[PDB]
Each structure stands twice: as structure tokens, then as C-alpha cells.
Amino acid sequence: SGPVPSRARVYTDVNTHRPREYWDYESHVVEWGNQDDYQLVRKLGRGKYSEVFEAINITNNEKVVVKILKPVKKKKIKREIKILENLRGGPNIITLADIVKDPVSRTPALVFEHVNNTDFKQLYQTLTDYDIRFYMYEILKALDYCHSMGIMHRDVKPHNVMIDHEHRKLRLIDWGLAEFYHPGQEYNVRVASRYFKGPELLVDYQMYDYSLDMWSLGCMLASMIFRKEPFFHGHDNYDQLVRIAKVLGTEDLYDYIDKYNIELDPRFNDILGRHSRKRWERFVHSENQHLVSPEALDFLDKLLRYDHQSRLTAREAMEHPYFYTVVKD
Numbered sequence: 001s002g003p004v005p006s007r008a009r010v011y012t013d014v015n016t017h018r019p020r021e022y023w024d025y026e027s028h029v030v031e032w033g034n035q036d037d038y039q040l041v042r043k044l045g046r047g048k049y050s051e052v053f054e055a056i057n058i059t060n061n062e063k064v065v066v067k068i069l070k071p072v073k074k075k076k077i078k079r080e081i082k083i084l085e086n087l088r089g090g091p092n093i094i095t096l097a098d099i100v101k102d103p104v105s106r107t108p109a110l111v112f113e114h115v116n117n118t119d120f121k122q123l124y125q126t127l128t129d130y131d132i133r134f135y136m137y138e139i140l141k142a143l144d145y146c147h148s149m150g151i152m153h154r155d156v157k158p159h160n161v162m163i164d165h166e167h168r169k170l171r172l173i174d175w176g177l178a179e180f181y182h183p184g185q186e187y188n189v190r191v192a193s194r195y196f197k198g199p200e201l202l203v204d205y206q207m208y209d210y211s212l213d214m215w216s217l218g219c220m221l222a223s224m225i226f227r228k229e230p231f232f233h234g235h236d237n238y239d240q241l242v243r244i245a246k247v248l249g250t251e252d253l254y255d256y257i258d259k260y261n262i263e264l265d266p267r268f269n270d271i272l273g274r275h276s277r278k279r280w281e282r283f284v285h286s287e288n289q290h291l292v293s294p295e296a297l298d299f300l301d302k303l304l305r306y307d308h309q310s311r312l313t314a315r316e317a318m319e320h321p322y323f324y325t326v327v328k329d
């Protein structure tokens, strides 16, 4: 008789209490600026949904970032715009400045605040345990905020975190996969990058919530403290769950599937096998030891849980001992 339903343990009804317009993005009419206000300077990157440029607003000579969209359905563009507008001003959320159209290419372009992104090399060689805790706390502020505002990012990963290290500035970007949380709603599981997908996605449990983001965050944390990117390295979606199971163990996985009456693909029945839960100590070595503490491992353990309901919330995570020194500042 099908899967057991689930509700977010926090911020469950935040959208129900808002005016319809807040979440009903299909109804949104896009406010369009003047394309001619921006001159493109240089290409910064390409990202499947878009090409990203540094530009200048010739109205006031401010440096800006332009994300020119590849073709996507108008509803998905409206969704991303509405979410960016709802979250604008929130802690560490990228600021959408403007929205334009090339009136010949009909391509829509989002115009953002400029953040300088310090080079991976000069940063990932020169981080420190404190820095990781600090930036993780900054990400948690953005996640608690967006969750509190009824939105799930659904694509938390290093690529979507900008850091300007010189200014100790962090921004969560790429809100193109984010969605409003509504109690009872069945979502598309085919989101997020393979390595960061929650067990709920991999077993096709659609009634998920903000807690998805907390799994992804745990994946990020593991990759940083252990110096292993990606941490869970699956070869496809099936093997991705196997890689998780080889660490978290199969007993808890099967407990989760039982609790929610989830129907596993019969393919999985072959490849999952039986796996012990591993101690985190097997990923520690001389090179990463300076990043790993009892507190880090306790925190990580409490993010990486099959059962979405048992993961730390963003606000609980922020209260964890791993962050006591950062909070003191």
C-alpha cells in the first residue's frame, strides 16, 4: 500500500501561512531591466544551465556578474527568480540585481552582485581547521535562512559556494534547482550532483524536505576534513547508494526502507550486499589529521543519516560544539 508519508520536522507550514503569490511562481511576471545597461567583460565559467560573465553596469560603472541562461522552461526561470527575490537580503545569499533579455537572442540573463572568488589552489592549500568551521557556519546561516523561508536549495555542493577569502565573505549560489517546501508534496528525485544525492533520492522517496540539504552539507564536510573529493564516489546512481552503504552500513539502510515502506528496485537487491558501519577513523591520515577532531566527527555523524527525519536541522547544526570557537568571535 505504497510508501509512508513524511513531513519536515521544522518550518513545515511556512509557505501555507504566506500569501499564495510568495510560492506560486507560475503566476510571477518577471520585472525586466534594460539589457543595454550592461557590457560584458570576460567569460568566468559555463554550467550546463548557463554561461557566466563578468560585466559592467555602464549606468554607474559597478562590476556585476551576468548569468546568460541556456534554454529552460519559463516556469523554471520564474521559480529561480521568485526564490532569489524571496531570499534577497538574507545571510550569505547571492544578491540578484536585475533581469534582462537579449531582444534578438531572446536569451534571459540574470544580473548579480560581483563576488571575487579566490583561487581554489591558494585556498585549498591554506585553509585550516578554523577556516573550515568558519565557512561551514556561514553556509549554515544561508541554509537555516532559506529553509526558514520555505525553500530547499537541492544542490548544495562546493561548486555552489563562493568564497572571497580576503574579505572572509561567502555566498551560496546557483538556486536553479531550489524549490518551495509544501507538506505532502512529492518532488522530483532527479536533482543534485551524484556524489551529494541523499539516500531518499537514490531509493526514489519523493516526499522529502529541507533535510536533503543537510545530507549534501555532510558530504561537503566529509570531503573537506578528510581531503577526499568526492567523498562518496559512486559510478552511477545505484553504485552511489552502495558507496554510502559501505560506510554507514546496510543495517540502518534496510531499517530506513522498512520504516517508510519504500519499494526498492530489484536491481539494488543484487548489489547492496551486507556491510558493517565503519568507524570514521579509517579515513584519517597524517595529511588530514589537523582537520579532524572528535567534534568534527560527531557533527558529521549527525548529518549523514539515511533517515532524513533524524538528520540535524541547520539551526541544531549551528549549535554544535564544532562551532563554539567561531561563535565566540
Ligand SMILES: Cc1nc2ccc(S(=O)(=O)N3CCC4(CC3)CC(NCc3ccc(-c5ccccc5)c(Cl)c3)C4)cc2s1
Pocket (backbone or CB within 6 Å): 044, 045, 046, 052, 065, 067, 094, 112, 113, 115, 117, 120, 123, 124, 131, 132, 133, 135, 136, 157, 158, 159, 160, 161, 162, 163, 173, 174, 220, 224
Ligand atoms: C552569482 C555568480 N557569480 C559567479 C562568479 C563566478 C562564477 S564561476 O563559474 O567562475 N565559479 C567560481 C569558482 C567556483 C565555481 C563557480 C565557486 C568555487 N567554490 C569552491 C569552494 C567552495 C567551498 C569551500 C569550503 C567549504 C567548506 C569550508 C571551507 C571552504 C572551498 Cl575550500 C572551495 C568553485 C560563477 C558565478 S555565479
